[PDB]
């Protein structure tokens, strides 16, 4: 009775949205991005290799000063690195050995940490007492942490493993707003440069744009075919690229609500773990699954380079806010800085 | 103003020395332990036996058998979509797989078989190995003796199956329950030797609900796992 007519209304709505997508697709950028000459071969060498972690390194993040970085590994240790002089500033021990996310606050005072313990532990880097002391502890969800980012010092947004995303206040330690629209568990969420929207990608082969004010969805991008693993905004804030385990990386656009350009090769056989861009947004980097990582040109789908320096996975990869370094994480407990 | 940044890097080097000293202190602590994952099915009974012998997302147990310390991690408050959080547990020495070997979801045994299949054929668990437990074989004996819920009507291979030569004797053993229990073993080893080649192996052992030697049995299994990994690195096997 109700279920079949609801399903046929959903099908009619989906057909209408597909027609609306097809109406505004007057052209593709494959015939418009060929005019600018390609960047050619791009080769970069391991400048510094930060050694000292034991287990697999799952996530890293840079700082606002583009000088300090945080690495979280599965041995239960979080290390603040000094990327200029290969130095270790702090080595924070963790309550849970398994972590898959770490964050650096924009004010440089806090480091967030989370993992399979269903707890986002946030530490304090300032003040004159001995060592590093955990300030708050957020536990209000029923699934494993996947990735967490900082809005500012006052709030933090977390992507969870129970098909939910949550916005957490710091002082009260409560969920201000929750984002429940996904059907599979969410891994990667990336914040817009204006700190007002974010897009979260899950294992339902789709990514959803949100707001942090009203707490509802905006777009429902469906253009993939497997579990989306990583996501990262353009520096301009009107496009974003996702990379799934289907060995393809796809770039979407916020304004036309269509997938713009995909990158694929026949020899590419392994999925995507991490995706980050450059300062100009021209050169996007995809941490791959076949024991190395790659460079894409993001206007025309051409492989402009390759970086191969790992004996294992490329679990995470980040690029500084200034753009003078490319950082990579790996399962062979080694961080490398490329320039 | 050279002295200011000079003693700044001096203090930075001192902090580096202290942090590296602490890291080297904890490196032996990390490498001196062995990590085990418990997976499901009677897991509560065997972990209670572990606690007698010795909603958070991860539960903590500690062993101290024979002056070797073991990590055992049992998962909870997590969804059944276990495809992407199990990639963390690849550096563990062994994944303990407890299977309720009496419930034959309409069939629990087939679900156990493809959970084993997905663990075996995954592209990140090839290095790690599995210790298999056929828990709840006491009710298996009563179900075999009843004969109203026979494995024959849910398995066509049981009609033509023959008993292996390696029979384990224990007084008052029904031949039919031994035949069924070793067929249940063989169903798991078909998957185990379908693709397992040198890198990892299965260790199929049978425990009741009142057994107590599971600690020493997991001890021996980790011993053989470390020995086989070392022997494969020596090109000796």
């Amino acid at each position: 009775s109700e279920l079949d007519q609801l399903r046929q209304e959903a099908e009619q709505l989906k057909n209408q949205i597909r027609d609306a997508r097809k109406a505004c697709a007057d052209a593709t950028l494959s015939q418009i991005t060929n005019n600018i000459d390609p960047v050619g071969r791009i080769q970069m060498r391991t400048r510094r290799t930060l050694r000292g972690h034991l287990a697999k390194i799952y996530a890293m993040h840079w700082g606002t000063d583009s000088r300090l970085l945080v690495s979280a590994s599965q041995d239960g240790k979080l290390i603040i690195w000094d990327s200029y002089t290969t130095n270790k500033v702090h080595a924070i021990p963790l309550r849970s050995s398994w972590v898959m996310t770490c964050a650096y606050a924009p004010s440089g005072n806090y480091v967030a940490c989370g993992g399979l313990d269903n707890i986002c532990s946030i530490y304090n880097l300032k003040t004159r007492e001995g060592n590093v002391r955990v300030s708050r502890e957020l536990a209000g969800h029923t699934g494993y942490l996947s990735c967490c980012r900082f809005l500012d010092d006052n709030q933090i947004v977390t992507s969870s493993g129970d098909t939910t995303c949550a916005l957490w206040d710091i002082e009260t330690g409560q969920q201000t707003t929750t984002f429940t629209g996904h059907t599979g568990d969410v891994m990667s969420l990336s914040l817009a440069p204006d700190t007002r929207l974010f897009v979260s990608g899950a294992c339902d082969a789709s990514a959803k744009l949100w707001d942090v004010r009203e707490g509802m969805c905006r777009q429902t991008f469906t253009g993939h075919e497997s579990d989306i693993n990583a996501i990262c905004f353009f520096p301009n804030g009107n496009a974003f690229a996702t990379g799934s385990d289907d060995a393809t990386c796809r770039l979407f656009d916020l304004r036309a609500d269509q997938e713009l350009m995909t990158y694929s090769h026949d020899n590419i056989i392994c999925g995507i773990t991490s995706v980050s861009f450059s300062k100009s947004g021209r050169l996007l980097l995809a941490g791959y699954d076949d024991f190395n990582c790659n460079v894409w040109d993001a206007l025309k789908a051409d492989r402009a380079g390759v970086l191969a320096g790992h004996d294992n996975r490329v679990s995470c990869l980040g690029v500084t806010d200034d753009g003078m370094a490319v950082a990579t994480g790996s399962w062979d407990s080694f961080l490398k800085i490329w320039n | 103003k050279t002295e200011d940044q000079r003693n700044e890097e001096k203090a930075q080097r001192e902090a580096n020395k202290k942090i590296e000293k602490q890291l080297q202190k904890d490196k032996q602590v990390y490498r001196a332990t062995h990590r085990l994952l418990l997976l499901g099915s009677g897991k509560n009974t065997i972990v209670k036996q572990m606690r007698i012998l010795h909603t958070s997302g991860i539960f903590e147990t500690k062993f101290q058998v024979d002056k070797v310390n073991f990590h055992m991690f049992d998962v909870g408050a997590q969804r059944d979509e276990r495809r992407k959080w199990i990639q963390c547990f690849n550096d563990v020495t062994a994944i303990i797989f407890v299977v309720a070997s009496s419930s034959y979801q309409t069939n629990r045994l087939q679900a156990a078989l493809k959970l084993f299949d997905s663990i075996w054929n995954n592209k990140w668990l090839r290095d790690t190995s599995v210790i298999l437990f056929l828990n709840k074989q006491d009710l298996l004996a009563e179900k075999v003796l009843a004969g109203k819920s026979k494995i024959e009507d849910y398995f066509p291979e049981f009609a033509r199956y023959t008993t292996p030569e390696d029979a384990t004797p224990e007084p008052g053993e029904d031949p039919r329950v031994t035949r069924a229990k070793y067929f249940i073993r063989d169903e798991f080893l078909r998957i185990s030797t379908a693709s397992g080649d040198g890198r990892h192996y299965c260790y199929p052992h049978f425990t009741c609900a009142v057994d107590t030697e599971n600690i020493r049995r997991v001890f021996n299994d980790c011993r053989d796992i470390i020995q086989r990994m070392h022997l494969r690195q020596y090109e000796l096997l």
Partner: nanobody, 128 residues
């Protein structure tokens, strides 16, 4: 978009024949081995049969083999079941489940209570 729309299904007599046909669109078909999962009225999800990427390795459960045969035509983007010697205890809603990863032998969370790459489901009822 990724979707799986399947057809067939109806009230048939025991021991009859019924071609449970399933169709797909979007994703490529040469990779992505696909299984069959059924859920009985009053029971959880259970697996029936699976096929490989090329179509060489076919396996079935205990209550299905020798009676039901599955097949895949990757040119026509169609994979279907074949019901023969149909038992009264096989009534269920059948889902055209799909493995989440390209060309990996392992297949995870096919029988999960919530899933993304799974069909809506067609109901087959068998009775006298």
């Amino acid at each position: 978009q990724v979707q799986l729309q399947e057809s067939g299904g109806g009230l048939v007599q025991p021991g009859g024949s019924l071609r449970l046909s399933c169709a797909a669109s979007g994703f490529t078909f040469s990779n992505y081995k696909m299984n069959w999962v059924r859920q009985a009225p009053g029971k959880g999800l259970e697996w029936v049969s699976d096929i490989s990427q090329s179509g060489a390795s076919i396996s079935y459960t205990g209550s299905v083999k020798g009676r039901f045969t599955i097949s895949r035509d990757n040119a026509k983007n169609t994979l279907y079941l074949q019901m023969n010697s149909l038992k009264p205890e096989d009534t269920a809603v059948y889902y055209c489940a799909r493995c989440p990863a390209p060309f990996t032998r392992d297949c995870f969370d096919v029988t999960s209570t919530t899933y993304a790459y799974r069909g809506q489901g067609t109901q087959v009822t068998v009775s006298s």
